[PDB]
Amino acid sequence: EHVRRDLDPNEVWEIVGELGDGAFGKVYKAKNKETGALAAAKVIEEELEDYIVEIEILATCDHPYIVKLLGAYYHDGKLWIMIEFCPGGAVDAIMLELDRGLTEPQIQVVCRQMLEALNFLHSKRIIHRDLKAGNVLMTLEGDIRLADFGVSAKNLFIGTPYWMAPEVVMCETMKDTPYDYKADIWSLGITLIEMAQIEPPHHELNPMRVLLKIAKSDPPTLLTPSKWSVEFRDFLKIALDKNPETRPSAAQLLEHPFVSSITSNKALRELVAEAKAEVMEE
Amino acid sequence: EHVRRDLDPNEVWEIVGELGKVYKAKNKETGALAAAKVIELEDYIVEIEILATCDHPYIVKLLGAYYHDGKLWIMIEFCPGGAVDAIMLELDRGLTEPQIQVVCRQMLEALNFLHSKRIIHRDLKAGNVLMTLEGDIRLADFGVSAKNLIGTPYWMAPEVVMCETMKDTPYDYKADIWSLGITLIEMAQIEPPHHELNPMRVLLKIAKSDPPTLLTPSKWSVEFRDFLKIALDKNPETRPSAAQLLEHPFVSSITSNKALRELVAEAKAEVMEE
Numbered sequence A: 001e002h003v004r005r006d007l008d009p010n011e012v013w014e015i016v017g018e019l020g021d022g023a024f025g026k027v028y029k030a031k032n033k034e035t036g037a038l039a040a041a042k043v044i045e046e047e048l049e050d051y052i053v054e055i056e057i058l059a060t061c062d063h064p065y066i067v068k069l070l071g072a073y074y075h076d077g078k079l080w081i082m083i084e085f086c087p088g089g090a091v092d093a094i095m096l097e098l099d100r101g102l103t104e105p106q107i108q109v110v111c112r113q114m115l116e117a118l119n120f121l122h123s124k125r126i127i128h129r130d131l132k133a134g135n136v137l138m139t140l141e142g143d144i145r146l147a148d149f150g151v152s153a154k155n156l157f158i159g160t161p162y163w164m165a166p167e168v169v170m171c172e173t174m175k176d177t178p179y180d181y182k183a184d185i186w187s188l189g190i191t192l193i194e195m196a197q198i199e200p201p202h203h204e205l206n207p208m209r210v211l212l213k214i215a216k217s218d219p220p221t222l223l224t225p226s227k228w229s230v231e232f233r234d235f236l237k238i239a240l241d242k243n244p245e246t247r248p249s250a251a252q253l254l255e256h257p258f259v260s261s262i263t264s265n266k267a268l269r270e271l272v273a274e275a276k277a278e279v280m281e282e
Numbered sequence B: 001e002h003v004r005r006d007l008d009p010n011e012v013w014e015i016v017g018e019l020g021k022v023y024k025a026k027n028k029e030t031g032a033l034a035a036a037k038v039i040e041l042e043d044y045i046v047e048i049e050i051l052a053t054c055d056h057p058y059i060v061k062l063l064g065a066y067y068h069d070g071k072l073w074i075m076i077e078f079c080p081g082g083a084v085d086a087i088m089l090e091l092d093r094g095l096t097e098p099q100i101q102v103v104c105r106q107m108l109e110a111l112n113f114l115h116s117k118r119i120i121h122r123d124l125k126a127g128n129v130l131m132t133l134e135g136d137i138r139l140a141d142f143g144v145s146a147k148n149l150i151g152t153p154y155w156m157a158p159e160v161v162m163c164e165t166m167k168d169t170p171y172d173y174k175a176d177i178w179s180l181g182i183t184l185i186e187m188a189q190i191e192p193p194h195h196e197l198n199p200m201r202v203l204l205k206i207a208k209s210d211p212p213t214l215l216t217p218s219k220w221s222v223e224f225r226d227f228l229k230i231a232l233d234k235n236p237e238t239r240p241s242a243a244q245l246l247e248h249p250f251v252s253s254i255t256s257n258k259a260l261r262e263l264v265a266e267a268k269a270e271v272m273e274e
């Protein structure tokens, strides 16, 4: 497997803090006794069947911009999942701590590296399905790591076809290639608005009403278009296409001028240095 | 459970024919005939709970379920008329309009029952309509039985919102109303629409084409054609429910199963030929 039962993780890892309490189980800051390496450890009390799925995904997702699995153990009735620690925290928290949105140049770095990560996931037939700023972790170098928390949404014949209703044909066709991946391109567009404006579109509406709103409204656009370049607004226009057939792929959007010339993560390294300096205030 | 482990089914049932495997079975005490599905469990208990809840005149009737000697038994009341699609093959014709009205009436009543219990069939077709010798239907499902009871919303793509909204009330039940409309055409014409296309191309066709209509509209009443027009609405929002369609003049005056009893008598007499 990708899970070790022979080894007790307490022999190798020291729990040195707490991070989150997602309903799944506790999550700790952990320090490696041999190396000093820092990790975030999710510990969960054959219900394991559902949970091994996450580890197989992570194990396949070896890429610079996706969280990096350091290990998985099952020991004394508890499942351990050890990810490399991203000291910068999530982008949404960074915006709360600085009490502002990202500059356009910080959003271009984010966008560029997300597109690269998505191009990788999709070419492996993995769909994220929960993109948002809370799922983008930052390193102190200014690189993202795409993550997923909570009820991890990542993942790889309802009748005889002559009798199938059109809406059932459509919702089955949306579940395989090349339509399924398009959902992430949309959510990416919304994440960019969230990073620009702090809140996603329709944030004022309760969760049930916002579904209606998404289905029936024109695609969202930036609140103050004069703050933003035409490249950003065109990127959104194209990504936030309600039609998944014409919505471009990650590989296509990497050639859009919003991101095609980004060759430096400087702007995002600066953001993380500033967030750290702000956190330090007392 | 709804499954007995105390009782060996061979003590009560005699296998007397073939239809895992599925047998014609005869009750040693009563003489009652049953169709028995025997299987080499989690996936399979779902079917029995559905059947156990679906006590209605026009839905297959569960007589019992046993688990014994590593085998799961599911016993349904035997419907001697067979399935409607097989009847059309044996007679080498479609149903008359009066026979389709009885079928339509009774299917609507069955669907109204299933949907009011939050059960969706999802595989309606003439091959799933069993007939009794009295001329009543029994709605069934065979094969991989299809009967049954995502992200944070601000970031969700419109197509994902739509395909999640189609999975709960009142949109999910609408799929059956469509399939009912296609079943009526299948009974009128023997084959469903687009039967010439391979299964993968037919999906594209269903999504992109206008709704299907009857090949020779002058053979059929305006009530039948209007019923289809209304039931084969591509928009599940405006597609009517089973309860609404029961008030359509195609079926609102049907008070006799005579036409369908005659069909089953004729099919039986045809089968007898040798």
Ligand SMILES: COc1ccc(Nc2ncnc(-c3cccnc3Nc3cc(NC(=O)c4cccc(C(F)(F)F)c4)ccc3C)n2)cc1
Pocket (backbone or CB within 6 Å): A019, A020, A027, A040, A041, A042, A054, A057, A058, A061, A066, A067, A081, A082, A083, A084, A085, A086, A087, A088, A089, A090, A128, A137, A146, A147, A148, A149, A152, A154
């Ligand atoms: C309070 O301030 C901080 C500061 C830094 C951090 N840093 C950090 N670094 C790394 N991970 C975490 C983390 C925090 C809370 C919960 N989980 C975390 N990581 C984590 C992620 C996962 N899984 C995934 O991210 C995941 C699962 C399925 C698919 C995918 C993907 F599609 F993206 F590849 C990703 C599994 C186990 C763990 C411990 N947190 C957190 C809070």
Ligand SMILES: COc1ccc(Nc2ncnc(-c3cccnc3Nc3cc(NC(=O)c4cccc(C(F)(F)F)c4)ccc3C)n2)cc1
Pocket (backbone or CB within 6 Å): B019, B022, B035, B036, B037, B047, B050, B051, B054, B059, B060, B074, B075, B076, B077, B078, B079, B080, B081, B082, B083, B121, B130, B139, B140, B141, B142, B145, B147
């Ligand atoms: C070859 O000639 C004949 C002539 C008469 C018959 N009659 C007949 N009568 C009753 N059942 C069967 C039958 C034949 C082959 C397979 N299964 C049959 N019935 C059956 C149906 C079920 N389940 C359902 O129909 C079912 C399952 C889930 C949901 C639902 C529904 F949503 F419709 F309620 C229905 C389970 C077990 C069995 C043995 N067959 C069959 C073949």
Ligand SMILES: [Ca+2]
Pocket (backbone or CB within 6 Å): A141
């Ligand atoms: Ca690096």
Ligand SMILES: [Ca+2]
Pocket (backbone or CB within 6 Å): A199, A203
């Ligand atoms: Ca908020």
Ligand SMILES: [Ca+2]
Pocket (backbone or CB within 6 Å): A277, A278, A281
């Ligand atoms: Ca300061």
Ligand SMILES: [Ca+2]
Pocket (backbone or CB within 6 Å): B191, B195
């Ligand atoms: Ca055929």
Ligand SMILES: [Ca+2]
Pocket (backbone or CB within 6 Å): B269, B270, B273
């Ligand atoms: Ca004859």
